[PDB]
Symmetry: C3
Subunit: 242 residues, 3 copies
């Protein structure tokens, strides 16, 4: 179980990376060609934010595709791992923007949003330190650490944002809850795949692992986007409470 070695360099996962790259690209331009003539100031804002997501994911995927986005991490026993660090560079900007989109739709104050980006980014960096960790003690401490943060993100997402989004139209609250649910479950798959992936225990090959992340990423990016830029809630209405 691996895929295809598309660059004659012993990395059959490049098949999933390539497809991943291709999919983020068409999304970036689907969204761009889709909002190109949108005059609504609220929506064009959602479009801009959402277009950059697959946009930056595309660079990370292309990077990993070529091999530039991956690095060899020697463990404490001399055992080498191929860590695709670029994912974190990706996530450092993508996840915050995704949150941003949820925060705009919910009409939350700048403090909540700031808390959101800060805790989320703390999560990504610490997740990256875990990835480059040489000792298992450290690799797992960072995991729980990054996870505590994610726990905080989900919390404020499932309370502050949700209740704030309930003060708006049913059309709006509807769309918010059907991205927050998507977020909740889709995002959660990430830490699991990591601790069971090659960065953790390792009962899942890098191939399947690279396949999972592609599916998870595309769906969290493009799938989220399609749904979001397709709703009517983004068309007008500027609330304020919570």
């Amino acid at each position: 179980q691996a895929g295809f070695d598309l660059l004659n360099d012993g990395r059959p996962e490049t098949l999933w990376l390539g497809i991943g790259t291709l999919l983020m690209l068409i999304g970036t331009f689907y969204f761009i060609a889709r909002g190109w003539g949108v005059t609504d100031k609220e929506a064009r804002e959602y479009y801009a934010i959402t277009i950059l997501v697959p946009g930056i994911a595309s660079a990370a995927y292309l990077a990993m595709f070529f091999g530039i986005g991956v690095t060899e991490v020697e463990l404490a026993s001399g055992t080498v791992l191929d860590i695709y660090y670029a994912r974190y560079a990706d996530w450092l900007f993508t996840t915050p923007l995704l949150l941003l989109d949820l925060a705009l739709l919910a009409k939350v104050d700048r403090v909540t949003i700031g808390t959101l980006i800060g805790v989320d980014a703390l999560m990504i960096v610490t997740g990256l330190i875990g990835a480059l960790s040489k000792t298992p003690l450290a690799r797992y401490t960072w995991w729980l650490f990054s996870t505590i943060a994610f726990l905080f993100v989900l919390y404020y997402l499932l309370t502050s944002l949700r209740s704030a989004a309930a003060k708006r139209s049913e059309e709006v609250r509807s769309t918010f809850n059907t991205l927050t649910a998507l977020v909740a479950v889709l995002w959660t798959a990430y830490p699991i795949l990591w601790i069971v992936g090659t960065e953790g225990a390792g009962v899942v090959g890098l191939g399947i692992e690279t396949l999972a992340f592609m599916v998870l990423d595309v769906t969290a990016k493009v799938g989220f986007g399609f749904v979001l830029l397709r709703s009517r809630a983004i068309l007008g209405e500027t609330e304020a409470p919570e």
Copy 2:
């Protein structure tokens, strides 16, 4: 004079790093458990900002603790130094937020704040380049360079912010001046400890040096926090001038 070699890897300073890590953690949660039910929108904002500080310091300390946050820098004479670079990753986000807190309490315009973060970050990066410098000529040029910037930060802090904070309540001006004084002296210790530390001349071992930074950092983070989140000035009142 060193401390304790807590990880059997020849780094007795890990004793100070560990304690440093532990102290930033309890602070992060002290503040979190302390503002958890704060409805005041002004204060919850100060809380959020201030909670992230020990929060990010904790990741840097844990990083250095494990050894991941330190790197060997070969000098021009083949002489190796153990540079704890992670401190700068820390400071790149912590010092700006600390400034932010002072800027909110003072009610300064967005231009002043922008100038503040920009010059301060310039200071940290240049300080980091100095740390990784191989030649002493370069290591000291960067020091003065980073110091010129810090000089600008202290300046606008002791004039623009101070006078702007004097237009507010005595309770507010009081708290502002008792953090700005703390800032002024505590922050200043940093460049001194550096030029006299292992990154500069070196009349102070990495142990004592790592001890000093821990004391300085905890007091600048948690000490600042305690004092700030404990004042009444953060509870309400939204001015505007200067």
Copy 3:
């Protein structure tokens, strides 16, 4: 054709780097000494933004000057290249601020500006990945990629910003168009010099190349600055449309 080997380390381009460093410094302080007593809140804002540009360029130039800002990139054939990566660290903050200045003068909404920084930064990073690429296939893919983004930047600059700047005074529109033209042509020289520089085909030595970038950078930084901080358009007037 090279210049002068100012540090006895086989890098005659340090002559252009040094001059580049020196020129960014006097600019940083020319601007600082020039706006030191400016009370106009609009202009002081332009000044602050514009002062940081040569300011950060100075750190990058000094970095490259010492050699710290350059790294050896082994190509797929074992052929080594001296990549001055620091330029991108430079550009990651400088180009966005330059755009910022154009966006303020034009009075564009926060969405346009956000789109601007995001696409521009995507351009710089991807340009940096191209620089560190080992294969030519990859080095050129990244070039087109970074170029597509730049294409988007020029687009929204020559339409959204321009038309938005035409709603203001003739004095304002005048200055906007005489920086946007400068931007348009000066910025465009960059990708060309790259693909023809040592990072691409290579029909231009690193000396001339390092000379060109210095001329291009100084003129885009200090030249832009002089012109901008010298206009009357920055003195007052706060519009709003587009």
